[PDB]
Design an enzyme around this catalytic site. Sequence first.
Site, mmCIF file in Angstrom:
data_model
loop_
_atom_site.group_PDB
_atom_site.id
_atom_site.type_symbol
_atom_site.label_atom_id
_atom_site.label_comp_id
_atom_site.label_asym_id
_atom_site.label_seq_id
_atom_site.Cartn_x
_atom_site.Cartn_y
_atom_site.Cartn_z
ATOM 1 N N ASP A 29 0.790 -1.232 0.000
ATOM 2 C CA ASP A 29 0.000 0.000 0.000
ATOM 3 C C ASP A 29 0.824 1.287 0.000
ATOM 4 O O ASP A 29 0.560 2.186 -0.794
ATOM 5 C CB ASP A 29 -0.970 0.031 1.190
ATOM 6 C CG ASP A 29 -2.014 -1.082 1.136
ATOM 7 O OD1 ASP A 29 -2.245 -1.643 0.045
ATOM 8 O OD2 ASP A 29 -2.619 -1.386 2.189
ATOM 9 N N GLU A 68 -10.594 -4.266 2.086
ATOM 10 C CA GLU A 68 -10.612 -5.505 2.858
ATOM 11 C C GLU A 68 -10.797 -5.257 4.356
ATOM 12 O O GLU A 68 -11.456 -6.041 5.046
ATOM 13 C CB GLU A 68 -9.324 -6.317 2.626
ATOM 14 C CG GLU A 68 -9.130 -6.843 1.197
ATOM 15 C CD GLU A 68 -8.495 -5.818 0.264
ATOM 16 O OE1 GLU A 68 -8.380 -4.644 0.674
ATOM 17 O OE2 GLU A 68 -8.115 -6.189 -0.874
#
Lengths: 250, 249
Positions: free
Chosen positions: A51, A160
């Site tokens: 990320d 998620e």
Amino acid sequence: MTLQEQIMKALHVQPVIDPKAEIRKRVDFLKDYVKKTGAKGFVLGISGGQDSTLAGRLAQLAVEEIRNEGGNATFIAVRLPYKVEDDAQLALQFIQADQSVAFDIASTVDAFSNQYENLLDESLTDFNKGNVKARIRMVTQYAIGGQKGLLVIGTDHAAEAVTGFFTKFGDGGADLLPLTGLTKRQGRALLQELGADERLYLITYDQLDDYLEGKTVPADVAEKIEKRYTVSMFDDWWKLAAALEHHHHH
Amino acid sequence: MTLQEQIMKALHVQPVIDPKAEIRKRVDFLKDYVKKTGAKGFVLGISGGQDSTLAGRLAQLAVEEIRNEGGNATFIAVRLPYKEDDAQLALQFIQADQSVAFDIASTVDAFSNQYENLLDESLTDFNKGNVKARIRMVTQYAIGGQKGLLVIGTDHAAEAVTGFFTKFGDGGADLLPLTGLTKRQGRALLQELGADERLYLITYDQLDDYLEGKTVPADVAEKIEKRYTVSMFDDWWKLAAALEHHHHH
């Protein structure tokens, strides 16, 4: 709408994406926020994680574009080790930020821990110390941001996580979230398009990402996912629940 | 519906309140959150400020009721000095189960010293103000995590969400028991709770008049509604404050 469709809409996930267009849209998102706020650029903690590697590269492209257009923008990437990775270094080589700061958080974390263990007369558990470290990392990014007039880029509140899986330490607060709407595997697609070293990106994530991307998944897999989504920001609920559970079973 | 009526509704501010009813309402809110999360109580930083003084007393009343009803609950009040007459007076009014004195100076200075060395520059007063506020939250969440407690927050006050009297820190917390109350109404609850006058005694009066649905001069409404439109609203102003201070530094 089926629950799956409601979830996708809530998390802004798309079944099919165009990597180049996604990069374009997200670099624009970053450039637009800089302009709207009057900020001088961005700051982001680089951990070697997928990320921050992706978000960091997008930030560098964004400031370069702003400068190319005659504006003023700077990107400061900061590595925040606790005492003691090659993944973080590899990410920095891919990002090629304007400034790369090495800021060990150990002296701050340890001063806090030592004070805590002395005043409360008990030892900080691994889980709670995990949250202390995450928060101290944010203190560092916000101090740099405040001192340089930069916006703090965040990588928490991932699709998620909001769904209830793979929660991260820390509170997830930030000034901007340029990866909103992307699944972990879609992010992988962006990194590929950006030419990142494959090593930077290489229920389960695949099952969960199939569901979030609107694909057809086994009935049981859907059941498990929807089960957690209904139990539930949704992400903040799971962060609190995790803290309580670890304390209970400690 | 006028813009003023819209803002009151969005912020949950009522034109008239009954102190006793508000207290019962907010004590129930705290108790209910405890049950829904499965937490063992609350933790709150006590600064001597009106907001934490009121929120702290409501927290103590909440845990006493939970216990009286046969449940398990604890309230831990923590004083977080940086190197506290109002704070001491507040603690005396709150009468918490546990009162912890946690000096944040060694943590704040360890960070400051590292920052000034690695970035080769001095932290400004404003930015250090945010560092202290965040370190105070680290402490509360560390205590909360270690004791199974919920962190009570006092930020995002009605006045702040409107764009005035912004506070240091990010305002993150697990629960906000004072949502909807104006600073003035807060004073009313404190008097009803029997607090020492010393604990509760555009300006706040103009702003609270507006938020309370009272008729105010057009220019006053104009200024208030202007900021409310220029934008979480509160978070926008926190960022703006940091940027403005850095700019004018």
